Design a protein around this nucleic acid. Structure first.
Lengths: 51, 239, 78, 89, 62
RNA sequence: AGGGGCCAAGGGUGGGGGUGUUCACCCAUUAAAGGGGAACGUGAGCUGGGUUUAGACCGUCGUGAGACAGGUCGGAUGCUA
RNA sequence: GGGCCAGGGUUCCACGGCAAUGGUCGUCAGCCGUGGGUUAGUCGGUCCUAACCCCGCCCGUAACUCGGCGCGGGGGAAAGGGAAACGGGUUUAUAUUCCCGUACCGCGGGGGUAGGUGCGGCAACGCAAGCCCGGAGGGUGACGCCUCGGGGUAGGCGGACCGGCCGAUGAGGCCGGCUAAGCGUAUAAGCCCGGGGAGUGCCGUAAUGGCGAGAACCGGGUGAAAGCGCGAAUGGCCCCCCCGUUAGGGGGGUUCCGCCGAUCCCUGGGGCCCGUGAAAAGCCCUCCGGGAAUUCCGAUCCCCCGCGACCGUACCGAGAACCGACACAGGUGCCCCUGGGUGAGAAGCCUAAGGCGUGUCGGGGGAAACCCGGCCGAGGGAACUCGGCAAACUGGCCCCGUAACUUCGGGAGAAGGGGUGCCUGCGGGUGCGUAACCCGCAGGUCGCAGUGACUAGGGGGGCCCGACUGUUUAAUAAAAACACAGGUCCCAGCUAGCCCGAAAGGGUUUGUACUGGGGCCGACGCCUGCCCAGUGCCGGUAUGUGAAGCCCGGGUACAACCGGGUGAAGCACCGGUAAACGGCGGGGGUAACUAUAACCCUCUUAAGGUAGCGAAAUCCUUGUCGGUUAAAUGCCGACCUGCAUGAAUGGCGUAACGAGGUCCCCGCUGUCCCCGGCCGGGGCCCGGCGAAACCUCUGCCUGGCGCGCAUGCCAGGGACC
RNA sequence: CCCGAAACCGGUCGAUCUAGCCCGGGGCAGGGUGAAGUCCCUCAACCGAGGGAUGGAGGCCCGCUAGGGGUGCUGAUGUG
């Protein structure tokens, strides 16, 4: 099917997805150069996981 | 030194060496809680099936107190034969009665060794025990090996012979058909020889075909060194 | 000459296939029902024989309905 | 559908939509013949249907009128002869 | 097994190891029902050892 | 037509049959079918049959593991200067 | 190419871009940025239970986060078992789920009537079920193998009609013509039932075969798929003629007849067997019926009101979303395996629906050498080489014919020889009436060649080994090795033997001598001599001997201690035992004649190599002789004195069989004499892109020397980058 | 002084690789040969003889079906 996620696993996948953003520009102003790179960036292909 | 051997694996009860118990069929019980004396008990052959692991045919019997149990099938049984259990069972084939109640010089199978333990003796295809002599003290019965064991006279047994004779009369034919049989039973196979097994694998025999030390082994020999002709009294076929 | 031994081909050697041809041939023979007496009994399975006419199923030898050992039991008497 | 292998509960009829899409459907297996069991014969006046279908179908199909619908009339043809002999003596 | 490693490796596909209900590391083996890291399923206790493993992360945390 | 000796390397000094064979044995030719050296010329050229891996068999030896320049089948030949 | 499981995890979808990423560019994208999307009573999860697992308890263990049994409970298949649904429409992205239509599960009401808790028919049997809590029982759920036949229809194709199109001539071709799940009403070979009553005994199936425990043969009954109608004039295809920047639309007509050929799917027989081939949830029936019944009751019959706890659904699913670090020529399950032509074909080629030209770097040199794939080579026909390795040849199909050998099964598709196209006209078979195919026959006739392509065995003989099929060093050895069927020796009476375990306990064992455990040998055919001296095993042991204990004596105020008897297994000792491990010898002398020695002496150490086979998968050695080659350290046959054979540490021999070792013959052939030319991809140049191995230095050559195998020291010579 | 290896041992962690064992499922174009089994005709008193059919077995053959294996080329690659 689907497969075939468990509800929770989708919660976890969703979280990893959240971590896989790019910071916003304004924080960056607030910082005035700065913590960047966002360090977690996870690529779907590039990386695994956990499950 | 070398690994545990082929026999030592067996003893673990690990699964390559574990009998299936889920494709296999019932065991014999005669049941002594309704006793032999003050009998009450006849039954009807409900069906006859082949039991895989006995390599013999077996009977389901429907008793008239309402219990269903298997009894190892006699030759020349019909489905709808009545089998009786007790001493006041008729003296005929497939009927079960105590040894004392059974005549001398009649063929008998499924003999008890402790009264009321359900048959622990003569439960193979086509082979049969002979009642040679009977005395109220002890009844001596002659076993399939030619060898006489004394049993209590209040053991149960069934009159007749087992069914499924000729069993080794027909050959096994090929390695395929044989493979098929061993799955039906349990018997570690294909089984090779120790002689071209390496010195690690097996106590006798090296790289090439020749035995190490003598094949013939002690009766006080170690576990894992008791392979070959075990405690042989003689060997060969000559003076 | 060949029996049912033709299945084997070239193979198994004389004695086994000769045995096989003989044992199967007799196995094939019409056998007299112990129940009725008409020549109905055929082999369902190993050691299991059944009479088409009466429907009786009974245990017997693997190849033949009756073995020489089975025959001995009848002779001692009830 | 979700079963791919042609397993037993799986088995297939071709179905047409008019769309002309032509999609595979599973079919329920076709009926095994209930027996007398007292002597093995397929029973007259005893249905065939799928074991699910019998739930939502009628009971008339599921029996004949005579006692023990499960066995054949001739096998019952034995049984009454016995029952009376039994009341008589 | 030896070489031809590419030819071989179609399993791993199946998974036998996860984020654990108890610890949260990547070792709750679905098949055994055992966490390799924490020891959940196996034991009431957390896995901890003289060598250690578990301890090392904790000290490191301090 | 030889035997034996001197000068002389300019040139020539082969083809096949057995053998893993350098050697050697033989055949038919040939003028003659010479010898020796070059990492016993020549594997960042080939070939890989043999010698001396790991599989196996026989003989001998050895209690046995196991061995043999005894016999024997099979057993990879990397690199963009 | 289409749909999906695992697995991945936003890769999906839109908009805006290109710094990075993509084996090159990039305006594209799977990248970057920013937003958004997976909706379920009727799909599946969830339920059941399997092989099996865990927990408590009992018990073990020093003890446990350890351990096996026995109880009791609970868990275990997103391809087992199993309640119920399809079609069409719509979205940027989702949909059997949202919408529309039609259908329906479970539970819970309500209202009627069968129902004095069912009436009516001799019977084979009729439906508008059978009041009821409870537990019981019984069928069905429910299961191994492969043919053959019977049915279903997805669907391939000719003819005819209706439109669209293409179009020398206006023909022929292409194309659209569809009907769902759910219902209602019908299924019918199996399988029962009456009548009848097996005459040389009859009859049937494709077939085996049925019958007097009911034939032949007549009427019934009875249980898969299938048809029609509802569903449905719709809807969905397909056109036509008008409205136009646009939007939103409108009116129309066709939407068809047969007959014919098929995977699968479902249903009977039948063949098989030293695999005799899980459960339960649930239904359906029945037994009893706790109670309620006549003001009654009940709702399987109708019709109708209400409701649906929870998770999942995106996309990919692959020569770029998986896994291999890589978008890797790898390799991982199913389903479409019946598209057309072909032809035995799920084959090749070509071609249709469908998909793509991102198996993601381009261009140039007619492109020389060299290298990979591949094409062709006269004459000769393996002279090459360890070796015909490689390669070639044969080739499909039909007909003829077919040896040695043999386990009579096979060898065998032996071998060898002939034929095969198109056309024109016939005949046969099956059927029904000229369909759908298939099998033959005659005539005419073209090419070099008719399996013209693609597909497509070279053959023959001796020998060695191993019976075969299988397996083997996953990844330098596929073999002769291994298994193997067959044969034999051995052990055990089940409270066993053997084996596992620290222990409790456990495997075999739902097992019981036709068992089941352990070795040896390794199909068949003929056989398997001889030895128990040595080793080993086994049985036994008066006697000697043989520990600790106890006893007695001595010693010690006790004790250590010392001595003797008593001394079990064990040893010495006796017998058996080689299909247990193993062994199985030497000299001399002698026969009409030269040869040898059938012959006769002698001694070790138990016995003295027997049936066989042998210069061997035997040193010397290329023995010798013979075959075979012109010529053969080969092979083969023979002799055989075997350096250093031999009988279940199996001997010999062997049909059939082999990606096994070796040898010969015929065909054939660029392996060779002896190489050429061609073709495509590289090479080589350009443009863009862009690494590695490794790195004291460097324009030498020759000799001498030197760690004795130098560019660099020494002496000459060559020497522009 | 510093570095340097093959071990050994103790407690742990793997059968998603792979080996065998078990449950429950699935896959495998087409073609050949032709056994037992069964039947008939003609010819013979019988013994049998000749012919043809039917059936359909195989650790079976052919096969680049799918799939499994991997012999030779000691070819191609051998910083793939």
């Amino acid at each position: 099917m689907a497969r075939n996620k468990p509800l929770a696993k989708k919660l976890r996948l969703a979280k990893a997805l959240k971590q896989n953003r790019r910071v916003p520009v304004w924080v960056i102003v607030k910082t005035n150069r700065r913590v960047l790179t966002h360090p977690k960036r996870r690529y779907w292909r590039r990386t695994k996981l956990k499950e | 030194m070398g690994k545990s051997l082929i026999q030592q694996r067996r003893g673990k009860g690990s699964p390559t060496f574990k009998s299936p118990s889920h494709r296999f069929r019932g065991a014999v019980k005669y049941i002594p809680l309704n006793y032999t004396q003050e009998k009450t008990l006849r039954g009807v052959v409900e069906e006859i099936m082949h039991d895989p692991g006995r390599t013999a045919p077996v009977a389901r019997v429907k008793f008239e107190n309402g219990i269903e149990k298997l009894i190892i099938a006699p030759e020349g049984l019909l489905v709808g034969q009545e089998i009786y259990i007790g001493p006041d069972a008729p003296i005929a084939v497939g009927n079960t009665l105590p040894l004392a109640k059974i005549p001398e010089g009649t063929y008998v199978y499924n003999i008890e060794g402790i009264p009321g333990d359900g048959g622990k003796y003569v439960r193979a295809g086509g082979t049969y025990a002979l009642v040679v002599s009977r005395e109220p003290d002890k009844v001596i019965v002659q076993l399939p090996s030619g060898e006489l064991k004394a049993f209590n006279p209040m053991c149960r047994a069934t009159i007749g012979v087992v069914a499924g004779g000729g069993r080794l009369e027909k050959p096994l034919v090929k390695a395929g058909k044989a493979y098929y049989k061993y799955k039906a039973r349990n018997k570690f196979w294909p089984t090779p020889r120790g002689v071209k097994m390496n010195a690690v694998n097996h106590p006798f025999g090296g790289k090439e075909h020749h035995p190490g030390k003598p094949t013939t082994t002690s009766r006080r020999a170690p576990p894992g060194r008791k392979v070959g002709h075990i405690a042989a009294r003689r060997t060969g076929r000559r003076k | 000459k060949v029996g049912s031994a033709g299945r084997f081909g070239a193979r198994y050697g004389l004695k086994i296939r000769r045995r096989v041809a003989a044992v199967e041939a007799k196995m094939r023979q019409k056998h007299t029902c112990p129940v009725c007496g008409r020549k109905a009994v055929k082999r369902i399975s190993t050691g299991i024989w059944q009479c088409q006419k009466c429907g009786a199923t009974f245990a017997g030898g693997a190849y033949l309905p009756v073995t020489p050992a089975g025959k001995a039991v009848r002779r001692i008497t009830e | 559908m979700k079963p791919m292998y042609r397993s037993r509960s799986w088995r297939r009829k071709y179905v047409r939509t008019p769309g002309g899409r032509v999609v595979i459907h599973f079919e329920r297996k076709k009926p095994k013949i209930a027996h007398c069991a007292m002597c093995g014969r397929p029973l007259n006046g005893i249905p065939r249907g799928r074991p699910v279908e019998m739930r939502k179908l009628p009971k008339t199909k599921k029996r004949p009128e005579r006692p023990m619908p499960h066995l054949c009339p001739r096998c019952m043809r034995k049984v009454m002869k016995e029952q009376i002999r039994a009341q008589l003596s | 097994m030896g070489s031809g490693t590419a030819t071989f490796g179609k399993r791993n596909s199946t998974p036998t190891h996860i984020r654990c209900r108890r610890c949260g590391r990547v070792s709750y083996n679905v098949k055994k029902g055992y966490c390799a890291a924490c020891g959940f399923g196996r034991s009431r206790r957390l896995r901890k050892y003289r060598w250690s493993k578990k301890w090392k992360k904790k000290k490191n945390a301090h």
